[PDB]
């Protein structure tokens, strides 16, 4: 941080904690020892200043569809050896329970699209062959899979 404005803002924010030890009772070593961890915690952020059940499965299926080439799909899901239908098939394969195609799942899909988690690619008028893209960071999807008790790394073709 060489920005004068930013550094001055940081100094203004952190001065009250700087001046506490002397109030509590020119001791350079004492002040530095008391103050170092707070400075490290502040430096952790220099420039910075609960989904429904089936939504998690939709999100992980979308991530898998986006980042896994189609050729390997059966290799990961077919028991013996992106478009919306691929997403539906992957979701049906992943979930251990039989999920009915209620309109509520489509409402979830549209809500996820609105929340800017899934990006629509094709024309808005074409609602029979729609295309989607997933824009979720990998750490987020790993955390949500952990909260779901699912191991996504075992299915990611690129990592294997």
């Amino acid at each position: 941080c060489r920005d004068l404005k930013e550094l001055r803002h940081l100094a203004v924010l952190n001065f009250p904690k700087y001046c506490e030890p002397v109030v509590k009772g020119r001791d350079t070593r004492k002040l530095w020892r008391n103050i170092e961890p707070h400075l490290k915690k502040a430096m952790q952020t220099v420039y910075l200043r609960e989904l429904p059940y089936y939504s998690k499965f939709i999100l992980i299926a979308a991530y898998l569809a986006s980042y896994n080439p189609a050729r390997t799909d059966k290799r990961f899901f077919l028991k013996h050896h992106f478009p919306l239908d691929r997403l539906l098939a992957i979701l049906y394969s992943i979930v251990d329970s039989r999920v009915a195609p209620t309109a509520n799942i489509f409402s979830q899909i549209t809500s996820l699209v609105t929340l800017q988690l899934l990006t629509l690619v094709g024309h808005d008028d074409q609602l029979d062959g729609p295309k989607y893209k997933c824009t979720v960071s990998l750490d987020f999807i790993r955390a949500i899979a952990r909260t779901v008790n699912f191991d996504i790394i075992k299915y990611l073709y690129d990592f294997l």
Binding site: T28, E36, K40
Partner: protein, 134 residues
């Protein structure tokens, strides 16, 4: 794998046999750890500005950081005096002593003002270690 662990044990034993020591010392382990780590290696490291090698620069930095961090649980002149006391086993002439003093002064200044690993606190300024060096 475990094979590398056995190799490390063998290397420590080889170091022990080289020095004609009936027992193995941790210094041999520290020596072999580098050799196992290095892997890809250049022909020769470039000089650092009178010139000094990169390995010696890292060695001096490690020694000074370790001493300051140990004392944490100092002064510039006191630290230089300690260093010259520790390196007395190698210096054999007055010229080498003055060269070592020159080198340590230059290295401490360079760390203070270029690498930011050492922070000055207000002729004998206090020196502290940047809390993000491991």
């Amino acid at each position: 794998t475990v094979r590398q662990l056995e190799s490390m044990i063998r290397l420590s034993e080889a170091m022990a046999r080289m020095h004609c020591c009936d027992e193995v010392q941790p210094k041999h382990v520290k020596e072999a750890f580098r050799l196992l780590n290095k892997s890809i290696i250049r022909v020769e490291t470039p000089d650092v500005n009178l010139r000094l090698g990169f390995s010696e620069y890292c060695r001096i930095s490690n020694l000074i950081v370790l001493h300051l961090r140990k004392v944490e649980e100092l002064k510039r002149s006191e630290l230089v005096n300690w260093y010259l006391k520790e390196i007395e086993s190698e210096i054999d002439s007055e010229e080498e002593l003055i060269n070592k003093k020159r080198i340590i002064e230059k290295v401490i200044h360079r760390l203070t003002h270029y690498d930011h690993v050492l922070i000055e606190l207000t002729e004998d300024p206090y020196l502290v270690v940047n809390p993000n060096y491991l």
